[PDB]
Write a protein that binds this ligand. Sequence first.
Ligand SMILES: [Mg+2]
Ligand SMILES: [Mg+2]
Ligand SMILES: [Mg+2]
Ligand SMILES: [Mg+2]
Ligand SMILES: [Mg+2]
Ligand SMILES: [Mg+2]
Lengths: 226, 207, 72, 129, 83, 126
Amino acid sequence: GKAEDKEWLPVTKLGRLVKDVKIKSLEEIYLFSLPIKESEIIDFFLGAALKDEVLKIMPVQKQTRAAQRTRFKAFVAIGDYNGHVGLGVKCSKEVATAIRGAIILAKLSIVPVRRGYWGNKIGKPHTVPCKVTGRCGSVLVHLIPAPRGTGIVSAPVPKKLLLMAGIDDCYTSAWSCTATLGNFAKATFDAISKTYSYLTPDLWKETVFTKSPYQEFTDHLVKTHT
Amino acid sequence: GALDVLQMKEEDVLKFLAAGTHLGGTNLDFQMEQYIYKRKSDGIYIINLKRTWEKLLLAARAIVAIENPADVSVISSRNTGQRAVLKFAAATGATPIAGRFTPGTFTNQIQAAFREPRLLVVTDPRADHQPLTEASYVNLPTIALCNTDSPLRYVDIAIPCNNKGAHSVGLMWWMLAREVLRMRGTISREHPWEVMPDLYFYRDPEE
Amino acid sequence: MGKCRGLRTARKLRSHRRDQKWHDKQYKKAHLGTALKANPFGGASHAKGIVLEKVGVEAKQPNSAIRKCVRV
Amino acid sequence: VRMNVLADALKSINNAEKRGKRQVLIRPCSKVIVRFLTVMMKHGYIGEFEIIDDHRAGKIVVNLTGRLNKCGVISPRFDVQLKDLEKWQNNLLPSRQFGFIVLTTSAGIMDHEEARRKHTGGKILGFFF
Amino acid sequence: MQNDAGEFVDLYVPRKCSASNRIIGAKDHASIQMNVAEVDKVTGRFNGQFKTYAICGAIRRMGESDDSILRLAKADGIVSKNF
Amino acid sequence: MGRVRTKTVKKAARVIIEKYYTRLGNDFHTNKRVCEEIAIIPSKKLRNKIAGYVTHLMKRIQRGPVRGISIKLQEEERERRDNYVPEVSALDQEIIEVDPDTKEMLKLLDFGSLSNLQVTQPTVGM
Ligand SMILES: [Mg+2]
Ligand SMILES: [Mg+2]
Ligand SMILES: [Mg+2]
Ligand SMILES: [Mg+2]
Ligand SMILES: [Mg+2]
Ligand SMILES: [Mg+2]
């Protein structure tokens, strides 16, 4: 019937440089640590590879004068299988609104993961590059490198984010109240996010500052429209 | 800046001494300690003016490096600043914000005042804490006119000056508007600018 | 907040652990022997007996029944 | 009352790298600390350093770059036997591609990747990664 | 970050703070990328080139981006000592 | 009684004055007709209350400016006072003179004229 979709008129200086192809891929949106605020930028460079996996639907409820008003908290992980992942949380009055709304957050929070080698470099890194630790609430999670072919060794929950981040082999440990799925998943996501901010003897070469896209595309943004 | 054509000339020294920008407060920071020269024999500190000049030309070089002039948002909330920043928007193409700031102006894609600058000049870091702690969310450099006692946190180029409410606030903004225009090449150096600083001073009770 | 770490402290460590094991209930009843002496079996898995009589015991609330037991 | 002088030196350097400083003062000092800092410098984890005479134990000023991540001491100097060395560099080190165990041997104060080369074990001092 | 063939295997290469030398991960919305103009030294006018500086988030929120930028400017022809 | 006008009466009366300021005089029965002509108020009772707040606002605006209404004729008198003030054709001058500890601050910046001196009463404030 009707066709010729037009939606997503951007609302940001980044939405303009991304909708028009003037920006290549996330690796320059990350290089300047810019904040993504639209749920479509990720759907642009990805989408052909992203998967959504609901982890839990938890009914919480507050006490009210006459009654106990209950809402649902839906934990949704997301990620391709080549080095990106994200995990979002949203609470709402009905179970569909929460699941629809959490996917937008989990997209809006995708981070890059850095996979390294265990013993010798035979192409295509496979496990974490070093020993990483991450906390939330009382939960602590520790991720350790492992030799090729061992497969992830963890509880069922972290063996859903570690797989969707693209890490094949990994050894793990956890401490305190792992039962609470909230803290157990934010702890894992944190220990993954820490992978690119661990300085290693290979990242010692002095850095060469290029120019940010807010400077290189200052013309296209001046002209065209505010 | 190191050369001669950028060194402080003896008439600017007399403007500075007339506005009293060298006069500081009674307190201090452990961060503004390198800008002080000494403390007077009644309890007040004195600001080294050559350091003022060097920090001024550093901020000028930070503003000049922005291609579109229209994203150098200039904020000021207190009265003694408002009139000044409005003239700055006239001098160079910047964008003024004088008055209350309405939290969330930088970080809310829904508000009608949502503007995304690339720099941020601001008077008085202690009375404009809100724009600072909101610049801390979107990678926004900062420039500010501090004092002997102004907390340095989320500011980058601190131009020491009185700014306690004086002719000194207007004088500082005017001199900063002169040096941006000069080194961008829109007016010529060592021909005195036709504008007069008093266009930037505040309305004390009129007449 | 303090545990001897030095290079010749092994006597203290061992003699202190050997003591603190006795506060662990599950270890204590394996080794005091007063449990095995008091066990109504012999410390075996099963035992033969002769049925003295048949009783019913009322279950603990909330749920309710009469539970049909022998006394041996 | 200051039983272990290397422990203070390494904790002092470490409490200051995290803060972001550019120079640190260590006091007292010793032949052992000076040898240890040399091992930490031949590999590039700190910059050059300067020793102050004062007719007592001296003091050291060290120039830090940001490359350092942790350094620490193993408090009883346990013995290690080149067949129990792996069980140490697999417990203390973060990954088999960087980091060093520093130990004292009859052939001087060295790092395990060299003790393996000269075929000798000895007493463990610390680690840095 | 290479392997036994040489070809780099990395999503990207983060940039380090110029005052603390700690890499700037891609969720640090306080790290800034200051960009300071050159002048032509004879007329006192801006001319193309400029010098870029990176400053971490943690040293920015401990009140030290100021003196850091100052030393980084003094280290070059932007202040030339004698301050 | 009450007589506390609702926010739907205090917003009409604010837009109307901005758009039509030169009609809205100072009596009520003429405003009650102007307001009926310009806007569409779907009641008599509401029309009168709107036209009755308009008169209050008009009486107030024939004094200083009110902080909800930006009228053209009263912007320019502020625009004037920002463009320049009746006080001076000179700057507030460079010819101003100061006291010690600043002569030595300039002695290390090289100034040599137009100053004064007075070593202040000899202990900190009291
Ligand atoms: Mg439990
Ligand atoms: Mg529960
Ligand atoms: Mg007891
Ligand atoms: Mg019991
Ligand atoms: Mg037990
Ligand atoms: Mg029960």
